Amino acid sequence: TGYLTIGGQRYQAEINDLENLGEMGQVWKMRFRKTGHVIAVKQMRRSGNKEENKRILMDLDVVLKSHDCPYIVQCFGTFITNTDVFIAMELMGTSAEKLKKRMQGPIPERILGKMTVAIVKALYYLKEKHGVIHRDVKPSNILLDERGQIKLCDFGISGGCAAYMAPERIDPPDPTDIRADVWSLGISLVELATGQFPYKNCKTDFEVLTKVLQEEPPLLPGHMGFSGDFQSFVKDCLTKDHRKRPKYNKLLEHSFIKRYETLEVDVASWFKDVMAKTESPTSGVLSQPHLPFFRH
Numbered sequence: 001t002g003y004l005t006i007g008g009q010r011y012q013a014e015i016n017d018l019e020n021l022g023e024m025g026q027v028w029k030m031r032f033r034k035t036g037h038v039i040a041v042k043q044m045r046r047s048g049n050k051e052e053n054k055r056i057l058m059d060l061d062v063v064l065k066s067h068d069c070p071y072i073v074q075c076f077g078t079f080i081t082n083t084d085v086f087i088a089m090e091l092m093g094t095s096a097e098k099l100k101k102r103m104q105g106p107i108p109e110r111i112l113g114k115m116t117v118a119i120v121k122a123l124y125y126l127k128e129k130h131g132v133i134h135r136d137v138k139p140s141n142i143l144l145d146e147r148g149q150i151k152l153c154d155f156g157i158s159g160g161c162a163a164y165m166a167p168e169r170i171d172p173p174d175p176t177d178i179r180a181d182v183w184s185l186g187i188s189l190v191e192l193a194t195g196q197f198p199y200k201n202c203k204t205d206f207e208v209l210t211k212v213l214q215e216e217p218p219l220l221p222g223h224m225g226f227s228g229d230f231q232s233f234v235k236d237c238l239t240k241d242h243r244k245r246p247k248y249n250k251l252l253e254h255s256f257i258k259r260y261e262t263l264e265v266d267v268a269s270w271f272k273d274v275m276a277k278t279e280s281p282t283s284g285v286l287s288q289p290h291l292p293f294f295r296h
């Protein structure tokens, strides 16, 4: 028997109840028959990889504690059987990674403003309330849905990848903190605002690390019509010396965040449009043969 809190109520449920609508891991899309809620149900097999299961349970632990942060995907409850743990979670629409890939181009600044409010408050909550330093902020961990909601993902939420790593995580100016995540947020925002990841030509992880340290920090192009506010926020996030890079509390007073705390933005529509538009309908194209051998 599982115990679900959803829809304002408390339910005692049999894992069997849940109508399976298919895999989305392993994560299943499932309908709770008693209410009509559609949810994501994560399956942790008792036999599974011991490292995966460790991370899943750490993440789960932080999520169970985070009911009062509106910017983190919520857990509705759990079921424990002899062979599994099933974890009922809020079902979103997509990760911003998927969304950038579907669109093949930029996310409008107004959507990214609402996104920055959400994600900075999520990260700050985690540090202030639970001592957690997320360490893996990237567009695959930013989730959106058709209600217009933008939340930080449970995956890795309990606290890396070369592309979003800050200078001080590669070579700190003194060996022997959340500002590394502020950098990753910056890189994420430049990537999504442009549709181009800032270190695209890199063919290896070490090469990426090299650009981070040797090159000027990436910027929002000054010619695309991003607001002065947005350019500043990104520029602050991408401060190479972590010692002068702002903490979340300072970011939360920044004009970019502050304006988008109350500016009306209809993210639900923009989301619905973009998902309809970019549905691949039919228009399938035969793939090209490999180039045959040739002697030059």
Ligand SMILES: C=CC(=O)Nc1cccc(-c2n[nH]c3cc(C)ccc23)c1
Binding pocket: 027, 040, 042, 073, 089, 090, 091, 092, 093, 094, 095, 097, 098, 140, 141, 143, 154
């Ligand atoms: C990187 C892509 C991605 O995460 N895509 C995606 C697309 C649509 C919904 C979710 C999602 N919503 N709620 C979740 C809860 C868990 C535990 C995992 C994924 C999701 C995730």
